[PDB]
């Protein structure tokens, strides 16, 4: 009955700070490693970041490298993600997802979902 | 029956068993001397009331040096080193008990897991996994704690003996009345309550079964319950069975508390009665016997868990013991496959009149024949549980056939060459169960590493676009079976694990049943490309997922038909 | 957080809670009175002269008593009468506690099981059975045993309060030393051993899962283990993980034994201290204060399990407690379906653009169109995971759709009539889960008896030729799922069970998967002939079973094509 709900990303002008908080429920939050994804207008999907079970090994992508720092709070069962600077692509609504969503097939999986927070920060 | 014990323990195990046995006896002598050491010290302290009565201070302390109050303090701290020493020595003994029991938990279980690994796949098939798992990890905990309960029992019955010897060394009518009152209390609780302990204790097991069973059954007909809409016929059977489970449970928790409660009022009565015999009978030694009355106190304080643990290990030597050691040999003395020989496959894989079913199951084949040349990429279309996975279990080195030969280059598949024949095949079980570790170990299946053999495999299994984005790369923890790896990611890893063996035959076994529509065909083509240099057997539960298969064998109701 | 309590328990569960809590306070006075009755009995047993002195013991000496030795013996049996009365008293108190705990294990679980039985079918599908099972018998188990711990905690801190107060009346410096020595040992052990108890105790929970998961993973890959042939790579990861699990367990069962082993040395030293300290001080009344030593002995001997049960209930008030009470307002206050109306079925079951998906998933349909006339005898041909049972569970009263009308004689299927429309459908599951009771109760689905309609059901389900050979016949305890009942006879009851409902639409849902063609064809032919006067939705998993089916709707990947 895995149901995740992230809500903490609104429209604020670029060059600032924006931390999103993803809440989870229905599974042992610590044993599962977590990731992030996004769906662009018209385009398919696109990956963001990833992190391990202990939170001591990080991962990012080249289009967002050196821009974000991911933290895991295994106390309130929340997956955070700091965000700085927005491009005409950093908008595709960052959901949450469960395990490692990162290949081009394991993205077609509804391992979390849940509303979402649209962050279309234009010029 | 003791001969079945030494058969499992080895020199690192047997020598450790003797060490605990001697320490069990020595720890007993330590407790006794720790009790007996109170008697002199507390005789001299109590000798202060009567001033002088024997050569115990003014006529005894003048043998070394120092005054009276100094020798009573030095004897006092001399009592508290021996007690802190005992508190450490008794703790170390209870540490060797755990080190031996939990060390044998590993030393013993390390071999039974190998035994159920070496049996033929049919012998591993006939018994389910929820039974073999208990056969390699449930029995070991019982035997380990049983041997530990046996050593602790020897320590205790020894503690009881020489401490009773210390009591008899002091008084006569008391230790007599005490022994009589003790064995009278050992009765009733063991012959009138101990039967009712299980008379209302296994009725609680009966009630827990009667409650769990109808609860699990009730949840299964929930669809039929919503159709019935009326739950009265189900809750009228639940409330009466729960209320039948209720009192059958409270009678267990009542008769399990009567022994100790009665033993408390007894302990009080046998305590105050250790006093009423000293003041009445004129042994009035203000220090000679008033010292001994503290010895009876400390002795009893060391004796109450002394008697409790004996019955505990006694029940542990009946609940466990004889029911664990016999099955052990039979499961570890079990027979394993033995064969030495090689074989070569260059031409075709004749089957030649298989005719097979499981041990006690009906024949799902009978005169099943086909042949597989090198690189045919065949399939097995079936009706699930009819005989596809059974037939493919026959084609591979598993399951010795009944009347079959299974020729390879006009050479029979038997136990001599089945060992070398099992090497050149992967499995890729779509719903592959991985263990929580690095994906590299999951591809190598733990058989060390070969790097130069992993990157090529990952590149062939189309995982190269997947390792890059991982945090620890090829070293990220896979997280149980899936969790961190979705269905087709596990497929790519399963393909990589098989390709890592560098095989010549690849078998799929329903490799398309745990994925979405989009994820299947891409993986299928990704396998078809890396199988161009190899062969393939597919157990597809559906049609058109094989199309590129030059052979399509459909197994119906015993016979093997061919489609495309 | 206490407001969550009264919402569950009623008035009787409050009158019985006060029944136990006042008893919890009173049982402390009984123990103290049982101890405080010792010091008089022993100070009179020693000094007979007390029976002719003081404004308390003079006249009773010459009231039927005659000499002094006769009355002290009478006082002795009066104490053992009080101690046998006290043992029976404590046995009754520990009998009501278990009756209340295991009484609420039923009273609460009955309501929670009734709550999970009436939720919508979608809410019951998303969560697994072991979760719900433990939510209605494991959660009730913890909360039941928790309330008793709180009562026992208050009873326990009470008996420590007035027993410590009874000791203070007896002595000044001794009780002060004992209290300081106690709160010094209440320290250290709670802040130096307690961390290592969990530092090596929750490491056990860590190592146990890390040892079981790699073991349970190898059993599922036993096929690939036979293929690899080399087990050194599996055992190099098993021995290294087991040699780690070994030490990770020896330190837990060692540090969990360090306290009581050090506690023994404490108990020994705090005993000989008391008597020595009380024998050096010149209050030696021969009896007046040397009897008080026995009160301290009985006080502490009653205070050792007293200290154990307090921390036991405190661990029960932290390990559980707050993790159970909150998850009942979120389990008991659950919401359920509504509506009150009737519905009729006589023309067609128009579906008309179904389109459906679960809570937070994708849509398996997107426009799905069909219509079912009364008596059409339709089938659904799909794959093992497409959505064959989903659409049929949508046609029937189950599954509230997202965009689907599910018309019934041009009338909508909503909450007001979903009850009535669910009343007129029967499921007949092929792998039917039977409960260990008479086959009559199985067919009635627990709805009492009904020999009128029920005798006709057996004649319809062709069990009559099977009831004859049955020993108890219609009252035959079926023997759990399937004792001596073959697969076909289980199907006959599956048909009989839904036939007792007097339905109008009959589901099957994969009624062909685990039985030979013959033992099922005789059942399939039985189905097509007894389905003429009703409608039927078949969810066949294989072909050729729907010969006489007039309609065959094949659902592919979102669209509905039609076959026969
Ligand atoms: N591990 C097992 N233990 C006992 N019986 C089994 C086991 N696996 C399969 N069977 C039985 O053997 C029959 C054939 O099973 P299987 O080989 O899975 O069929 P298929 O070859 O069509 O997949 C089944 O009816 C099943 O009851
Ligand atoms: N009992 C169940 N528990 C968990 N998930 C289920 C269950 N039944 C179905 N599902 C999910 O719903 C989807 C539809 O499967 P299902 O309706 O069982 O198809 P079919 O019954 O035709 O095999 C599956 O992808 C599966 O993940």
Author numbering:
A (entry chain C): 1 to 123
B (entry chain B), C (entry chain A): 1 to 564
Mind quoting what the paper says about this structure?
PglK is a homodimeric ABC transporter with an essential role in the protein N-glycosylation machinery of the pathogenic bacterium Campylobacter jejuni. It flips the complex lipid-linked oligosaccharide (LLO) GlcGalNac5Bac-PP-undecaprenyl, which is assembled through the sequential, catalytic activities of the glycosyltransferases PglC, PglA, PglJ, PglH and PglI2, from the cytoplasmic side of the membrane into the periplasm, where the oligosaccharyltransferase PglB catalyzes the transfer of the glycan to acceptor proteins. We have previously reported structures of PglK that provided insight into, and suggested, an unusual, “outward-only” LLO translocation mechanism, whereby only outward-facing conformations are required to provide a translocation pathway for the oligosaccharide-pyrophosphate head-group of LLO, whereas the undecaprenyl tail remains embedded in the lipid bilayer. A nanobody (Nb) is the minimal antigen-binding domain of the camelid heavy chain antibody, their use has provided remarkable progress in stabilizing conformers of other transporters and G-protein coupled receptors.
The PglK mutant E510Q was used for crystallization experiments due to its higher expression yield and stability compared to PglK wild type (WT). After extensive optimization of crystallization conditions, constructs, additives and cryo-protection, the structure of the complex could be determined at 3.9 Å resolution. Nb87 binds PglK close to the membrane boundary and contacts both NBDs, thus fixing the NBD distance within PglK. The interactions with NBD1 involve residues from the catalytically important signature (or LSGGQ) motif, specifically with the side chains of S486 and Q489. Contacts with the NBD2 involve interactions with the side chains of E359, K361 and K362, from the functionally important A-loop that contributes to the binding of the adenine moiety of ATP. The Nb87-trapped PglK structure reveals a novel, narrowly inward-facing conformation, with only few contacts between the NBDs. The effective volume of the central cavity of Nb87-bound PglK is reduced by ~50% when compared to the apo-inward-1 structure, and by ~40% when compared to the apo-inward-2 state 623. Since this location corresponds to the binding site of the di-phosphate and tri-phosphate groups of ADP and ATP, respectively, we interpret these peaks as indicating partially occupied ADP molecules bound to the ATPase sites, and thus interpret our Nb87-bound PglK structure as an inhibited, apo-inward/ADP-bound state, nevertheless, nucleotide exchange may occur in this state. Despite the narrowing of the cavity and the contact of the NBDs, the architecture of the central cavity of Nb87-bound PglK has not changed significantly and the functionally important arginines are still engaged in the same interactions as in the two widely inward-open states.
